[PDB]
Write a protein that binds this ligand. Structure first.
Ligand SMILES: OC[C@H]1N/C(=N\O)[C@H](O)[C@@H](O)[C@@H]1O[C@H]1O[C@H](CO)[C@@H](O[C@H]2O[C@H](CO)[C@@H](O)[C@H](O)[C@H]2O)[C@H](O)[C@H]1O
Ligand SMILES: *[C@@H]1O[C@H](CO)[C@@H](O)[C@H](O)[C@H]1NC(C)=O
Ligand SMILES: OC[C@H]1N/C(=N\O)[C@H](O)[C@@H](O)[C@@H]1O
Ligand SMILES: [Ca+2]
Ligand SMILES: [Cl-]
Length: 496
């Protein structure tokens, strides 16, 4: 559960949020594999509630009805087709496993689901699994509302309903087996791992009992004895009885303090500066590198639904976001996850977004296809951050510098920083309100290098800035605070 199971030399995964299976399959072949992306985190593939008030929100997918592979993203045949085509081209598939709960208790009984399966939240009947009232935590929860009321009581956070979501009794072997049957069906299809949703709301021992029932990965693509990659979503910002370290024996954990602090540093909040990033990682109270799944923003906090607050950098903050994603992809700490989103009509009323519910670009409920524009960007309101030159080239930078140590740090005591990754890469940042013009030590061999941020290396030449490294590793870098991208990155493969 700790090893990504990605192809050797591919170091990042991308969250293709709300994308259809046929579009991910095409993306695996046309972009992800040629550009060196390791994998894809997909939205929940299991049947969910079709919520019409409000109109088909993104969050309806976090309300399971059954374990049938039938969603707005596609059916079972389309899912298998995607997994097979992606694996054959070396791009892994990771499933967002929503296993803590079923739907909200206030949801109406009927067939208002993505595959037409009947369900009754009131009587706790989900015949398509099958689950009954005996499979839920209604008698185990000791709160007066039945929902989670206080986060200082570790027991209720696990045994009660997260905002009304019917809590599955995970101590029961029947419930563990039904979840394992679902996860094993997916492993055998070819998925490389899972995102365990709402892990904070499940007991570490209960998760371990479910993982013990899991198969090794499909031996047609993976070597014998390969265990599925497990990354648990535990939102731990400190100061709670539940720690993300309680989950280390099961797999990796999502490090939310990472995106929160990188956001405050780059926005320069509370006097924080980039020079403090010298000891970035464990020195800041984060989980150990080999247990961390890192990201700048996720599907939740990019629209204010998880934790991190107003500090979180998203595609809306384009210029600062590319620097954050650039820093993340260059720094050795943890396993990296790149976000790929869609544009929604943000509307701030009293400091908060009233349109945070808005689902994926659609036509009367049917999710729109990802159309490709002539400049490699996406149409139909898909932002496609993974396709932006600055982000795409930084994904390749991480691949080229894999295994190299953190060396040659420089800082001006403010926000102009720089570091190298052994003898394979170097990156410089300028987040100050003045220009940077200095000669720094790189650790890289002599030659002419293309800046992968301002341009590309197309047939023996650079389309952007050129950096000249001398015999002793020194190189002059000139970055203006007025530049579209106030950072320069050069690596072993961008060399002329
Ligand atoms: O997996 C359950 C949550 N835990 C998660 N990680 O721990 C997901 O990342 C997050 O997206 C999920 O909440 C999302 O999915 C929930 C179910 O759809 C939404 O709740 C919604 O449904 C509830 C029950 O019907 C309502 O009470 C609530 O007001 C309504 O917003 C919630 O706001 C939305 O952030
Ligand atoms: C690179 O481009 C420049 C013009 O920008 C040109 O002078 C030079 O010959 C090109 N190099 C090669 C190797 O073609
Ligand atoms: O306790 C942290 C945070 N963690 C959560 N789940 O793990 C909740 O969705 C959110 O409501 C809660 O505030
Ligand atoms: Ca629970
Ligand atoms: Cl996450």
């Amino acid at each position: 559960q700790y090893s990504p199971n990605t192809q050797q030399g591919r170091t990042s995964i991308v969250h293709l949020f709300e994308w259809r299976w046929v579009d991910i399959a095409l993306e695996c072949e046309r972009y992800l594999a040629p550009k060196g992306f390791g994998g894809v985190q997909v939205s929940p593939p299991n049947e969910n509630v079709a919520i019409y008030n409000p109109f088909r929100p993104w969050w309806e997918r976090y309300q399971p009805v059954s374990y049938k592979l039938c969603t707005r993203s596609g059916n079972e045949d389309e899912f298998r087709n995607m997994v097979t085509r992606c694996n054959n081209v070396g791009v892994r598939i990771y499933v967002d496993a929503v296993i803590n709960h079923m739907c909200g208790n206030a949801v109406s009984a009927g067939t208002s689901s993505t595959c037409g399966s009947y369900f009754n939240p009131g009587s706790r009947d989900f015949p398509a699994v099958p689950y009954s009232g005996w499979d839920f935590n209604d008698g185990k929860c000791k709160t007066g509302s039945g929902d989670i009321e206080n986060y200082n009581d570790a027991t209720q956070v696990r045994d009660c309903r997260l905002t009304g979501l019917l809590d599955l009794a995970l101590e029961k072997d029947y419930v563990r087996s039904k979840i394992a049957e679902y996860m094993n069906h997916l492993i055998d299809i070819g998925v490389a791992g899972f995102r365990l949703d709402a892990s904070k709301h499940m007991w570490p021992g209960d998760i371990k009992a479910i993982l013990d029932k899991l198969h090794n990965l499909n031996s047609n693509w993976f070597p014998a004895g390969s265990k599925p990659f497990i990354y648990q979503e535990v939102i731990d910002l400190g100061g709670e009885p539940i720690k993300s370290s309680d989950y280390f024996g099961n797999g990796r954990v999502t490090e939310f303090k990472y995106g929160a602090k990188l956001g405050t540093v780059i926005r320069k909040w509370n006097g924080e500066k980039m020079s403090y990033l010298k000891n970035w990682g464990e020195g800041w109270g984060f989980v150990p590198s080999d247990r961390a799944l890192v990201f700048v923003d996720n599907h939740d906090n990019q629209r204010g639904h998880g934790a991190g607050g107003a500090s979180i950098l998203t595609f809306w903050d384009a210029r600062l976001y590319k620097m954050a994603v650039g820093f993340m992809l260059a720094h050795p700490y943890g396993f990296t996850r790149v976000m790929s989103s869609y544009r929604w009509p943000r509307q701030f009323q009293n400091g908060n977004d009233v349109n945070d519910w808005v689902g994926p670009p659609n036509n009367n409920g049917v999710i729109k296809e990802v159309t490709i524009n002539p400049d490699t960007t996406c149409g139909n309101d898909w932002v496609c951050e993974h396709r932006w030159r600055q982000i795409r080239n930084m994904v390749i930078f991480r691949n080229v510098v894999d295994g190299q140590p953190f060396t040659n740090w420089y800082d001006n005591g403010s926000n102009q920083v720089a570091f190298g990754r052994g003898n394979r890469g170097f990156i410089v940042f300028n987040n100050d309100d003045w220009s940077f013009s200095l000669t720094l030590q790189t650790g890289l061999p002599a030659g002419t290098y293309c800046d992968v941020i301002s341009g590309d290396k197309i047939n023996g030449n650079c389309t952007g800035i050129k950096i000249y490294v001398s015999d002793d590793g020194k190189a002059h870098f000139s970055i203006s605070n007025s530049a579209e991208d106030p950072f320069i990155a050069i690596h072993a493969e961008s060399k002329l």
